[PDB]
């Protein structure tokens, strides 16, 4: 009796600890995504610049073939 009453008391607060710890990990994971998503948007913005620059370079290079 005295063992199972405490064996369920800690097993009840352990469900609260799992929910608490699961909150922290969710918080930390989202921060990880935010850090990743930001640098990816930056690279994609640089890439998007190079691509439009190269598209127009190829456009003029197509006119020398027209000669």
């Amino acid at each position: 009796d005295a063992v199972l009453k405490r064996l369920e008391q800690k097993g009840a607060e352990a469900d609260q600890i799992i929910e608490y710890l699961k909150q922290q990990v969710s918080l930390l994971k989202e921060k990880a995504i935010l850090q990743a998503t930001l640098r990816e948007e930056k690279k994609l913005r640089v890439e998007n610049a190079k691509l439009k620059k190269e598209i127009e370079e190829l456009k003029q290079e197509l006119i020398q073939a027209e000669i």
């Binding site: 199972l4 097993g11 352990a14 799992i18 710890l21 699961k22 990990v25 994971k29 990880a32």
Partner: protein, 32 residues
């Protein structure tokens, strides 16, 4: 009762290992 405690503790352990999988997974992909 005692049949329900071990099933409860079984879930806690299953959830605790899922947390560990997530926590360890994070520790890998954000390093150096």
């Amino acid at each position: 009762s005692l049949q329900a405690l071990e099933s409860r503790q079984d879930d806690i352990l299953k959830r605790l290992y899922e947390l560990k999988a997530a926590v360890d997974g994070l520790s890998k992909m954000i390093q150096t």
